[PDB]
Design an enzyme around this catalytic site. Structure first.
Site, PDB file in Angstrom:
ATOM      1  N   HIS A 307       0.808  -1.213   0.000  1.00  8.26           N
ATOM      2  CA  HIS A 307       0.000   0.000   0.000  1.00  8.26           C
ATOM      3  C   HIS A 307       0.843   1.267   0.000  1.00  8.26           C
ATOM      4  O   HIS A 307       0.352   2.319  -0.426  1.00  8.26           O
ATOM      5  CB  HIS A 307      -0.950   0.009   1.200  1.00  8.26           C
ATOM      6  CG  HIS A 307      -0.261   0.173   2.520  1.00  8.26           C
ATOM      7  ND1 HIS A 307       0.114  -0.898   3.301  1.00  8.26           N
ATOM      8  CD2 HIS A 307       0.109   1.283   3.199  1.00  8.26           C
ATOM      9  CE1 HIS A 307       0.692  -0.454   4.403  1.00  8.26           C
ATOM     10  NE2 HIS A 307       0.703   0.866   4.366  1.00  8.26           N
ATOM     11  N   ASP A 356      -6.243  -6.553   0.433  1.00  7.61           N
ATOM     12  CA  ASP A 356      -5.828  -7.947   0.429  1.00  7.61           C
ATOM     13  C   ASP A 356      -4.544  -8.115  -0.374  1.00  7.61           C
ATOM     14  O   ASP A 356      -4.269  -7.353  -1.305  1.00  7.61           O
ATOM     15  CB  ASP A 356      -6.930  -8.839  -0.148  1.00  7.61           C
ATOM     16  CG  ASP A 356      -6.683 -10.312   0.110  1.00  7.61           C
ATOM     17  OD1 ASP A 356      -6.663 -10.715   1.292  1.00  7.61           O
ATOM     18  OD2 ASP A 356      -6.514 -11.069  -0.869  1.00  7.61           O
ATOM     19  N   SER A 453       4.432   0.517   8.628  1.00 12.42           N
ATOM     20  CA  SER A 453       3.908  -0.260   7.515  1.00 12.42           C
ATOM     21  C   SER A 453       5.001  -1.142   6.928  1.00 12.42           C
ATOM     22  O   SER A 453       6.167  -0.747   6.850  1.00 12.42           O
ATOM     23  CB  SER A 453       3.338   0.668   6.442  1.00 12.42           C
ATOM     24  OG  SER A 453       2.285   1.461   6.960  1.00 12.42           O
ATOM     25  N   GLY A 454       4.620  -2.350   6.521  1.00 12.53           N
ATOM     26  CA  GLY A 454       5.584  -3.323   6.060  1.00 12.53           C
ATOM     27  C   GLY A 454       6.406  -3.974   7.147  1.00 12.53           C
ATOM     28  O   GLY A 454       7.251  -4.820   6.837  1.00 12.53           O
TER      29      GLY A 454
END
Ligand SMILES: *[C@@H]1O[C@H](CO)[C@@H](O)[C@H](O)[C@H]1NC(C)=O
Ligand SMILES: *[C@@H]1O[C@H](CO)[C@@H](O)[C@H](O)[C@H]1NC(C)=O
Ligand SMILES: *[C@@H]1O[C@H](CO)[C@@H](O)[C@H](O)[C@H]1NC(C)=O
Ligand SMILES: *[C@@H]1O[C@H](CO)[C@@H](O)[C@H](O)[C@H]1NC(C)=O
Ligand SMILES: *[C@@H]1O[C@H](CO)[C@@H](O)[C@H](O)[C@H]1NC(C)=O
Ligand SMILES: *[C@@H]1O[C@H](CO)[C@@H](O)[C@H](O)[C@H]1NC(C)=O
Ligand SMILES: *[C@@H]1O[C@H](CO)[C@@H](O)[C@H](O)[C@H]1NC(C)=O
Ligand SMILES: *[C@@H]1O[C@H](CO)[C@@H](O)[C@H](O)[C@H]1NC(C)=O
Ligand SMILES: *[C@@H]1O[C@H](CO)[C@@H](O)[C@H](O)[C@H]1NC(C)=O
Length: 501
Positions: A307, A356, A453-454
């Site tokens: 994302h 997803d 994030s990640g």
């Protein structure tokens, strides 16, 4: 007062080819989410060639998919001005979604597709050759010969694999030469070559070998040693009291920390991480700004969230991977290793509207050596389940508020795993698929935020730190009963292993 317009050119047939956005040589409306489905005949793919493309920045994107059904694939996510590559489909349906923001309306796009038999993919050459991954074919004498011929290396890859293996780390030693596969012998099998074979297979050292008897009629090849460090496979079929090699190979460099840490109980109120306590945590700076962390899975590959790289994949040179990152305000440390990015591959099953398959591979510019403060993360084995209630640690530089100052040092905290049923019962808004894993306290306090994030969901298993999650999304920070949802890496293990080779 700018709602998404519905009723655009959804179905586009063969004669209707030259399509474009509304008022292409003008400014398109903001907050518009249009879709141009490219139908075709059964058995012909789609080739979209953008005649003129000049869009906004990463805020506005054109997503090209090859769904043809409810589960949509992902072909490309184009953005920014300038010409782009021609997307090559594989089915008779292509979805062209136009994701736009609320301001800064750019010009727009315009293209003209074409339906044909296997367009994009080059025509297969004569059958007497082996085709590489890039379409080029090389003679059969050039594959698995110790010399790279393919542009990507398909001739010298997958030249040996396990046969009759009870697990993914052992089996037979079936080699491939001259486009034929055959086993080996044990008359002159030593330990000096076992670890070499295990390294050729992409594994650790050799534990043991149990030769019993030969059962296949394949032309088994004799193996010997060499002073120059080359595994010689002498072409011959003659051996007495032979036996197939049941080679057992150890794993690669797994989640084993090499620093000298201590024991400190901290469940609620996780403090800063010591220097080198998380070597597989890689930072990603996009123009002098950390956006989303990454997990080191190999010597030149990183796993990050899909994302944050959504739209920033056209120019991988703008990213900077910092290995061994400990402090955000001091990069002159001898443990920090800077590298560039030359390839960003988003997951084909990714969907930003459903959050997803939030996973992405990032190739490093140059290979980085492993040190005491830089170690690769350990991918979970096939058919591995993590039970709920398991306290797994995380790492990142999350911020207490959306537009404030983040922590300078690397933050870490332990969160327990949660089942998908209870997670959906706690999050009635989002959609929890079978490729997600929830973790976090329902009482609040210990919650991830922007900047993590990640980040990996590191779960320890037998003195080994695996990778059981990649940060995908989440509700507002510092709120109880809102556990973080991570992309289940256990479902994407083979997809990563296909690129690590
Ligand atoms: C193209 O689309 C128009 C209306 O969108 C339709 O009337 C026409 O039949 C289509 N096919 C052509 C022009 O070949
Ligand atoms: C799109 O542009 C023109 C059509 O006017 C044509 O010359 C070109 O080959 C087309 N590209 C395609 C169909 O991929
Ligand atoms: C081992 O290889 C033989 C090939 O002769 C095959 O028949 C057999 O199913 C394999 N597995 C076991 C457990 O024997
Ligand atoms: C294989 O093992 C035998 C056993 O003594 C040995 O004589 C021979 O030199 C070894 N190497 C080859 C190539 O036969
Ligand atoms: C080999 O496998 C055993 C498990 O049976 C393990 O304990 C050991 O560490 C492995 N490596 C070596 C060198 O024995
Ligand atoms: C950054 O780290 C180096 C070496 O660890 C140290 O000499 C330097 O003082 C640090 N910078 C600051 C601002 O403390
Ligand atoms: C990494 O390993 C290679 C292999 O010998 C070596 O040449 C190099 O000096 C090492 N260090 C770096 C920073 O590449
Ligand atoms: C997680 O931490 C709590 C804190 O007391 C403990 O009760 C629980 O057993 C831990 N879970 C695991 C799987 O160790
Ligand atoms: C996701 O949305 C669908 C509706 O299309 C719904 O049936 C499903 O239950 C949702 N997922 C969960 C985990 O509730």
């Amino acid at each position: 007062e700018l709602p998404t317009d519905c009723g655009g050119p959804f179905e586009l047939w063969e004669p209707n080819t030259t399509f474009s956005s509304t008022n292409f040589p003008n400014s398109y409306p903001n907050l518009a989410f249009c879709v141009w489905i490219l139908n075709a005949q059964k058995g012909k793919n789609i080739q979209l060639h953008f005649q003129e493309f000049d869009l906004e920045n990463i805020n506005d994107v054109v997503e090209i998919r090859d769904g043809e059904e409810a589960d949509s694939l992902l072909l490309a996510v184009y953005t920014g001005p300038g010409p782009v590559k021609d997307v090559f489909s594989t089915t008779n349906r292509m979805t062209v979604l136009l994701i736009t923001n609320d301001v800064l309306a750019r010009g727009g796009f315009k293209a003209n597709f074409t339906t044909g038999y296997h367009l994009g993919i080059p025509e297969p050459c004569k059958a007497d050759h082996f085709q590489c991954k890039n379409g080029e074919c090389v003679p059969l004498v050039n594959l698995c010969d110790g010399h790279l011929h393919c542009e990507d290396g398909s001739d010298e890859a997958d030249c040996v694999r396990f046969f009759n293996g009870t697990t993914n780390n052992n089996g037979l030693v079936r080699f491939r030469i001259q486009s034929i596969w055959h086993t080996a012998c044990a008359e002159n099998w030593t330990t000096q070559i076992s670890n070499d074979v295990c390294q050729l297979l992409g594994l650790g050292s050799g534990n043991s070998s149990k030769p019993i008897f030969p059962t296949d009629g394949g032309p088994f090849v004799k193996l010997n040693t060499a002073p120059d460090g080359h595994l010689i496979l002498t072409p011959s079929q003659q051996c007495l009291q032979d036996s197939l090699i049941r080679l057992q190979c150890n794993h690669k460099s797994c989640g084993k920390k090499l620093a000298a840490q201590d024991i400190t109980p901290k469940i609620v109120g996780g403090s800063n991480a010591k220097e080198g306590a998380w070597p597989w945590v890689v930072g990603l700076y996009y123009g002098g700004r950390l956006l989303c962390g990454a997990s080191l899975v190999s010597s030149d590959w990183l796993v990050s969230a899909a994302h944050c790289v959504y739209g920033r994949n056209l120019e991988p040179s703008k990213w900077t991977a910092i290995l061994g990152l400990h402090m955000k305000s001091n990069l002159t440390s001898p443990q920090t290793v800077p590298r560039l990015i030359d390839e960003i591959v988003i997951n084909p099953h990714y969907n930003r509207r459903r959050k997803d398959n939030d996973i992405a591979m990032m190739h490093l510019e140059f290979k980085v050596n492993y040190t005491d403060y830089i170690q690769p993360i350990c991918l979970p084995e096939e058919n591995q389940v993590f039970p709920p209630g398991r306290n797994c640690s995380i790492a990142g530089w999350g911020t207490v508020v959306y537009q404030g100052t983040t922590a300078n040092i690397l933050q870490e905290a332990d969160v327990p795993l949660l089942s998908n049923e209870r997670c959906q019962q706690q999050m009635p808004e989002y959609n929890i698929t079978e490729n997600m894993i929830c973790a976090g306290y329902e009482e609040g306090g210990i919650d991830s935020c922007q900047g993590d994030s990640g980040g990996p969901l590191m779960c320890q298993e037998n003195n080994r730190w695996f990778l059981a999650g990649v940060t995908s999304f989440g509700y507002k920070c510092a709120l109880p009963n809102r556990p973080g949802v991570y992309a289940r890496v256990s479902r994407f293990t083979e997809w990563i292993q296909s690129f690590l080779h």
